[model samples]
Target chain A: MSTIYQTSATASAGRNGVVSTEDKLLELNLSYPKEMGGSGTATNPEQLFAVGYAACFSNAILHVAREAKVALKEAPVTATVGIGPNGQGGFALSVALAAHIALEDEQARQLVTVAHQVCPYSNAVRGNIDVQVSVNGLAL
Target chain B: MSTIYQTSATASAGRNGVVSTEDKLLELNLSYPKEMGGSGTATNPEQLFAVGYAACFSNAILHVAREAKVALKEAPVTATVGIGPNGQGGFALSVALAAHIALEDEQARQLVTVAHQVCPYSNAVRGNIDVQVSVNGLAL
Candidate 1:
């Protein structure tokens, strides 16, 4: 219940608009992808979500590895986000997270399991969407 | 079932790391905010989530307004995201979205109600976390 961190951003004009944080640390113009019929000249919401999830999940991996005393190298997380109609008149997101970590297969999988439990982004979307998690090239 | 748009991003290091999209449209070095005890010198996941949700929700409002034939002027959305421990040794996020639209109070509320149903972000986190929505300055 105690907030450790909080941030706010405002967007004007919806998809093809400007979004910026209060500190101005993050500011960008957004445009739909050409696939979505916009200019595709700028970043979009799905990209933003992918980047955030990647960063948050990567950090979670490091945290878990450190806690477990595993000597893991840099863990880079790639998040692929897809948006489509849900047939319920709403759009839904699908996520696949690929974690590249230098550890044995079993250890890596276990680490990712704990990280998934600890990551805020993972917790946020758990049970709400299809999130495929993998360690290396193998799904876990 | 058809993906209208898809995107990917990769992050190295976790909370204090760099995240970038494949097309490089969005690239940011992230650090924990001063509130979370980091440098507070760079953007973080919460900020990214806020920006993405704000942009997505704003666009959803516009989409719904257009469908309803509502004449709304420049509907801007501000999303505030907070991260904290969930008391289960994991973390959780809380969100508040404020949409600024020039419309009659009742009409604006109705539009937001529909937008909430249509937005991908809203759909992703529905029933998972607390999302406070408002129109103008009034809670809806």
Candidate 2:
């Protein structure tokens, strides 16, 4: 099935080193130490990325599970994205994902695999970054 | 205003080192070359984290926007999560988030700040990981 989803957002700086986004409808004024860089009070771009990826992957799994007729209950997916020197000169991204699936091992694996295939963000970063996936706790 | 959400999944090992969910609805099987990781094939946990965070944060932003009486037109929040060595031991997460909002700078900044505050995942990860937030060509 071919479908299209439209998404957009805008952002700007505010007083007290605050950064806000129109699409997100949230305001954040972060402060970092001068040793890191800048005034050490502004929110950088990395935090937003982690929040976005975690949400996207969870939704994708839900969609895939529905398509596959799999049922889920009390499941939580946690994602962590890291960025730092690439050793080569620029920078690189390292990702780790953990799914707390309440179902049996077999079914959980099946749904996760299918969700990975359907997740757009996953496809986008497949070759560009280092990604790791794991399952937390299995029922029987 | 406190609410909770939860879900679950299951998995099993299929033929040929392939691990499939019990429902046969999804699977996690990968064969990465030695350069990347191993010769075996199986789905990892990192990918799952990415999907979850992406969708969750987007929804959080939408919810915040609705509460703030803002209109988001075709805007999508994109995020990437990474995991790697933490220098001491184990691993750490780094994230990057990009918002595509169609709004003015003033409005964008206001909303983004609020969204950051309201987004549960963002709040949870705050100070826990290295995160970056940015707006890509946002008018506001």
Candidate 3:
């Protein structure tokens, strides 16, 4: 069996956060927006979460498509993150994701099924909060 | 505008990648599998990055759904981090996400589109690397 090595690091300066390492590398400088109810300059941890999830999920889709022998011309997946009141007391997360796939309905549906099973993020939040998903275009 | 205050601290111990953090009112302790390829265990930054991105992206999706007026039941998002080699010749991060949503196709599509625009992580990786999105069915 082959063995793999992975490493990473993260640093926060001001409100922004950065993550990196000799192996896998990541950097996020988070900040608040005026419309979101903050001072509008401090970077929040939410931003980092957004970046990581989007990138990871997209890759998973591509991998699944390849494994399933589906040819996707220009499929792109986009992710969004939001934070607000939990109603019970504190705050909670709301996530939405869209997959712009250039495949027939059957193919797309199958891809989504496989991707959901293989994606890491999908595995992590299985029972934590709320996540939304959608597919665009019609069967052709 | 309304302002909210939030704070958190994270610490790592031993070499098994156990992480602990306490905030305004939340306390958490997690032990990550060393086989995932970290420096024995998850560093403070890794935990922050993992939890932060998962929560933020999930929140973004929920916010988008609300704006689109799509009623969603309790769902959750998950995030997984993979450290591996980038085809370009160095280390890279591979993230996967799964969104379980309870909505009709039209409403789910609308919510996802808006979430992509609103999530900060989507914005961060807008032009950096590839991000994939997938959906799973959940009971309403």
Best by lDDT: 1
* lDDT of residue B132 for candidate 3: 54
Q: For all candidates in order, state the fraction of native interface contacts they contain.
A: 0.93, 0.00, 0.05
Residues B1-140 of candidate 2 have per-residue lDDT tens digits of 11121112332211112332222223334222233355523323333334334544554456567677786544465555554444432234566666555777677666666666655445545655445776544422
Taking the candidates in order, what DockQ does each have? 0.89, 0.03, 0.05
* Pairs that clash in candidate 1: A59-B14
lDDT (Cα, tens digit) per residue for candidate 1, span B1-140: 78888999999788887899998999889888888788988999999999999999999999998888877668889999999998987899999999987888888898899999999999999888879999989998
Q: Where does model 3 exceed 4 Å of error? A: A1-5, A11-28, A36-43, A137-140, B1-140
Rank by TM-score, descending? Answer: 1, 3, 2
Better of 1 and 3 by lDDT: 1
**How many clashing pairs per prediction, in order?**
1, 111, 38
Which candidate, 1 or 2, would have the higher DockQ against the true structure?
Answer: 1
lDDT of 1 by residue, A26-130 (tens): 989988899988888898999999999999999999988988888766899999999999898889999999998888888889999999999989888889987
User: lDDT of model 3 at residue A15?
Assistant: 32
